[PDB]
Amino acid sequence: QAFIPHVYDEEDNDEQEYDQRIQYNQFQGDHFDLAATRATGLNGHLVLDCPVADELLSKFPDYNPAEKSGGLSREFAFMRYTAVTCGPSNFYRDAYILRPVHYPIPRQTELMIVITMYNEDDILLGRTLKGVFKNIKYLESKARSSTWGKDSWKKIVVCIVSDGRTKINERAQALLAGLGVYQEGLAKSRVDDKKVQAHMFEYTTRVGISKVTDDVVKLTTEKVVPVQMLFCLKETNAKKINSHRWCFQAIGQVLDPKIVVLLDCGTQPSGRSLYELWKEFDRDHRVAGACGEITTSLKKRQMITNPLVYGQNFEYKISNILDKPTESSFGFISVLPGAFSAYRFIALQNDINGVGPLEKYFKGEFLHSSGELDPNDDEFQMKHLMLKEEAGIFTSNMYLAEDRILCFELVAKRGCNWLLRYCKSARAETDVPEGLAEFILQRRRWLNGSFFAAIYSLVHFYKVWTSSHSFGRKIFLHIEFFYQLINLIVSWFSIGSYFLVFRILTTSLGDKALGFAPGKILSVIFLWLYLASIVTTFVLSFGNKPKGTEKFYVTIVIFFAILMAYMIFAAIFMAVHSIQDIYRSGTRITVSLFFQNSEFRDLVVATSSTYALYFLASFLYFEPWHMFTSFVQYILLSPSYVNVLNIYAFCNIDDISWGTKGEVGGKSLGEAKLREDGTFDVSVPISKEQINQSYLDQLEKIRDPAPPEEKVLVTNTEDYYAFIRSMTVLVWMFTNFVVIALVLETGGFNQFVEATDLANLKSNRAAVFLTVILWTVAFMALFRFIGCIYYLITRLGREIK
Amino acid sequence: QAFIPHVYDEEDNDEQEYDQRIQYNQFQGDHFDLAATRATGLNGHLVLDCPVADELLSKFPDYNPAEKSGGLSREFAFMRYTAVTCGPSNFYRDAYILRPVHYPIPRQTELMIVITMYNEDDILLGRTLKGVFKNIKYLESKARSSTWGKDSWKKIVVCIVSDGRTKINERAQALLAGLGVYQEGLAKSRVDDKKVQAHMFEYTTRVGISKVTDDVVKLTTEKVVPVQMLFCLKETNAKKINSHRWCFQAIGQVLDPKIVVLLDCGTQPSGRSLYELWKEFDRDHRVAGACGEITTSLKKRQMITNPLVYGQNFEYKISNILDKPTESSFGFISVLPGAFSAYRFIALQNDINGVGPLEKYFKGEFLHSSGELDPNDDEFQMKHLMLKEEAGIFTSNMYLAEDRILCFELVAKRGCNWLLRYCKSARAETDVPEGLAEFILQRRRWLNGSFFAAIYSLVHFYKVWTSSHSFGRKIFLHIEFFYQLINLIVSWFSIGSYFLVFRILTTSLGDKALGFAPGKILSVIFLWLYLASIVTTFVLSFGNKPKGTEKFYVTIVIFFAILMAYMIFAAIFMAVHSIQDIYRSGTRITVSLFFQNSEFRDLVVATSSTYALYFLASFLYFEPWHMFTSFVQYILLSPSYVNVLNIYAFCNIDDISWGTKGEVGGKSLGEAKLREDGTFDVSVPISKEQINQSYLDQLEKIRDPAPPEEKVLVTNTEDYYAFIRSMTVLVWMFTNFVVIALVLETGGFNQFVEATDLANLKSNRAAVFLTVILWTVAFMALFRFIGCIYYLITRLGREIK
């Protein structure tokens, strides 16, 4: 029973109210001309208007048995199929017409909701579609709105760009077919001896997903608002940047929408999230990009059984509570999550000269690939011209930044005034990777992107000077740039700092002054295990794949968790001993004396202050639970975050997806067939003249000496990226080691000090380093706390107005 | 002018004498039946007897213008072509007949000379062919020989197995055609809808290479002994093991020769080398394998301009003078060079049960490859059965040993008495790689092979117990096994030992007792550069290819050479200071006192003794020049040998040649054509019944829940080999570091010692380690010296008898 009566859950009371506000009796479509086995394709393109299944029409309320058509409008009766051969670059240049703009009265799009899909299960697509449909129903129900209200569904288009014709999951395809967008027969591989790049299906579906259980998806036609669906199935997978090219460069130009919303399969927006994003864009005309709070689902996951899920939950909550508000207050957000964000279409458009955010974003796809262009592609000229252009370090490595480049390119425009804003009213829920390998692979992409984006923005900070912002705005943008520079410096030396803190804390327990016997043996054992884990992580990152050697990573993570617990114990013990010593001294006890004590101060005051700031920020946002349920897991996993993820990310900076190539010869000399008789039919030279001529040709060929040939080939790009990655890790290793040598004198530096002065000189440097690092962390926390408080105050003030 | 009058060089006086001993007027071939465009292929196989070019026949002395045939025999007039489809396993089972055995009177082969070729220049092939032809002429000229003499060329077959139909160099193919073996037209790709695995051309050429200059090759028919040529051109490259399978498993069974000789393109044997190898096999019936001295050409290479060539020259000379004689004396040679060696055919044959040296040798090819068998291959059953068999660690990694496995498998047979012998009378000259990358790639293959062969032989030493050898023979074989165990242990810890020696020597100069000011700063700088070089070598070995990043390796090698010079200087300085201190003490000077002095003893006596042993061994073999011309380069390159080559070899234990695979979909849904009118011809569903049935099918498909699917796939073999390589480097790193920590207390061990006792406890361990390592090297040198002296004495005694 695919179709079941509509049922509202406990949380669907708002949906019920929306339904009460909507009439549900005036879903009348606009008449449009159809396309006529011989078919009259429009403008020389293959276009087919096929009829939808009779059962699906019979489900619709407007269906009437008496009328053969059923009384339904043309758009509700026929689904349109178009075969696209040109590709994104020339889609607008060719006369490719989408149905929304083909009506006698053109429809102007107000909100384009892009969904990216790749071999995703039907459950994830069902959840995303249910969220989008609920949002559209809410927008329709809205009464006292200038832009929204009756017939609001005509201004909204849902675009699903599936990457990979043969990689799409069968069940998701079945679901889309059940909605009526897709039919199996229509697909065509080639048209007029030209490859079909993408298959586009268009239909205004009136089928709504009633519920999405864990295993099955139920669809019902009762109380469903029509939704314009565009399903663009790509013939071959070209990653996500190519899908975004299809969305922006090709479909966006034809539709010319406002406020393009980007979604990802499995991300379920709230009931009013899209309205909140639209309102954010509408209130302030300067806003060019926006993002919403992203949450992690914890439905059937236990606190103890899934430490990783809760660690990620805490990370997401802290990010949304501290980082995004501060950057939004400054007006420049480092990263807008690709799972849920929104952009204003006009802001992204390139300049007359051809330079703009979209050009920078797309260049990464072209440059980061094998230099093998098929001459038959119609985009051959564009790709050849792009490859012939002189590319520097930054241009040729844009693929690391990905969408992150867009944020900076928007803020620091030549003569434009744009800002990026974060709204906490918009919420979306997603499933985080439970397994360790997927987490490692996912964070590998985030870390590389963040590092490259930070470097690129910092190096090009001067571009904001020419932007038409207020002078105070530029001053505060420079303050934020300085903060990001400090954050980058702190993140670059994370592994060295972690090792230094661990070594100092463990060796401090070895001192005979405090009464801890196993200090020394434990410190030595932990040092050996630490070095072994680091070396194994490097070797596995360079050599093997995470999926295969997962148990090694699990063991390393467990060891680092135990080591973190031991480090916390050592710090507490060290502080207690220091406090006890002051009382044992016999001196007067004052508040200045506690602050004067470097050990107690650094170890306790800084960490407690950071925890208090996190706690207060969590409470002020009415989101306190993560500070209890998921704090411990995050604390215990932090060293793994710094060591394993960072090492794996840097070791694989190059993402070499393409493989080796081979011309593989195959001259078609010929074949020998066998007749009924034993004789074989062959074709070999017979005439003596031909044989003698061939022999003389061979003699003349071998008579002359071999001319020199100097290989001056451009070579392949995989070597270039392998080289870039190798240099980065080497510089990363060298700089970290220099810092470690200075602080601990591990290298030859101990040769310059005396044996009696070695013990006294190592201690002072360690204390200075500990205080510096801890107070740097604390001050960054305070900075973000002030940021978030300002964001709350200003948002409340704007709401009041 | 391809053909020129024969000219004899200064060194061709022996060739002139050979010519004087040969009549050159009775080169009469045996009549054989030919094969009849329709051709009557023999036994259902595609066989063609085409006529050779008229000019080539006209060159031959026996040609007569009056007779249309020319008076030449059938074999000299027609070249035979055969297309082989089955492959090596079934070549004998099918009725594939080679010309030498097809005569009315069968010819018994006495010497099969195999030459392996792959995209080699025509110069290398010309040199090899000139050497082989000169050897055949010498064998023919021999008068007072029971086996050799008149008509000796009938007992010798030269087999050229070219790997890769489309990778063979054009000029070498032109040369072979000029000889008359190859013609372009004959090749056929498919026969009876079956792929042609190999193309075999047979011809008894009477064309001899007069000379081989640096650039061109000249051929002349004057004073040439006929040679039986078999040119087996493979359709696709399958590395060298597959070529050896063609030689042994398929061609050898048909010909059934004795004493198969293996050669490599560019290796030029001496004028009497093949006779020496044959005599070695003939004298003693127990000998199953033999090898000869291999020399490095130094024609147009300067002493200073090519340090690498002279380093390799010294290495080869020392090997031939010390290692091979000792192993030959014991009767078991670890490696028989693949460039020039010989095997007795019957010794290699497998047992009735199917287990034997050849099976072990070939299993490596099958196991070490992608598990993708084409069902159309006729060897599908064999490969599938081999893959289904349970393979342990050793069986699945045989590909590392390569031919090395054969030596041990021959010596330690179940019930056979076989020995391996080295003869210094046989000499062959080859070109060593001048570039650094090629040297790195070539040594990468040697080191992996040697390590795995040593481990395999040591683990299975007990197999020699069942062999039918004399008890004393088994005792001495066990002595050799013990020596090889010590050598393996010494080689495993080479990198750690080198670092320890460098550190001890450099830090010794830092002591204030001796008056050297820059000691400390230089030691620290060198430590930093050493660590940087090691880390960069690891990273580049894992990440990049040697050809691309060659300058890094050049810089590292130059640095290591400078460091070696500095280490030698430090040792000399340390010894001089120690000798001076004894005189400054004021005590009596005796010979016992010098020996008592650990510093002087270890540093000077051991190294001088090793050098003296090398010098004496070189002189006794009448090969003294390498001890002067090329010693310094070898000494300066030794640290590079240990560090760079060993690191690169271990980092790339897995040799993953095969690439990724993709089914790549491509369902043939259909195409749409365009008619003269605008209408497009398409095929899409029309009947309502079919559409409704498809829709109901989709509904039923999506209605049921998704059943669980647990991935229990066997997976790919590349992960297995990546895993094996990763473990090996990790164990290699761990064991070396443990030794370093013990000797220098680098790890946490210094925490267990006092500051005043740290300086005194580090010195004693360093002295003990230095004496141990140096005297181990010296004693191994003495062992090999005694070995070589015994070899000389016994060889001279055998010659006298």
Ligand SMILES: CC(=O)N[C@H]1[C@@H](OP(=O)(O)OP(=O)(O)OC[C@H]2O[C@@H](n3ccc(=O)[nH]c3=O)[C@H](O)[C@@H]2O)O[C@H](CO)[C@@H](O)[C@@H]1O
């Ligand atoms: C948290 C979340 O909900 N999604 C993020 C997660 O995705 P996640 O870790 O779940 O997996 P991916 O990054 O591979 O997928 C990202 C998006 O790209 C699409 N895709 C994937 C593979 C492919 O060959 N072609 C293709 O188009 C996927 O369908 C998905 O819509 O890590 C990515 C790393 O960049 C982010 O970009 C995504 O925003």
Ligand SMILES: CC(=O)N[C@H]1[C@@H](OP(=O)(O)OP(=O)(O)OC[C@H]2O[C@@H](n3ccc(=O)[nH]c3=O)[C@H](O)[C@@H]2O)O[C@H](CO)[C@@H](O)[C@@H]1O
């Ligand atoms: C010193 C010398 O003179 N030859 C050695 C050298 O060869 P070298 O370093 O010169 O180059 P290779 O090892 O690649 O060639 C070895 C042999 O295998 C053949 N080949 C090569 C590639 C291929 O795809 N197919 C193929 O059949 C080559 O033509 C040659 O006959 O290092 C090899 C490492 O094992 C040794 O085996 C060779 O004995």
Ligand SMILES: [Mg+2]
């Ligand atoms: Mg996902």
Ligand SMILES: [Mg+2]
């Ligand atoms: Mg070669």
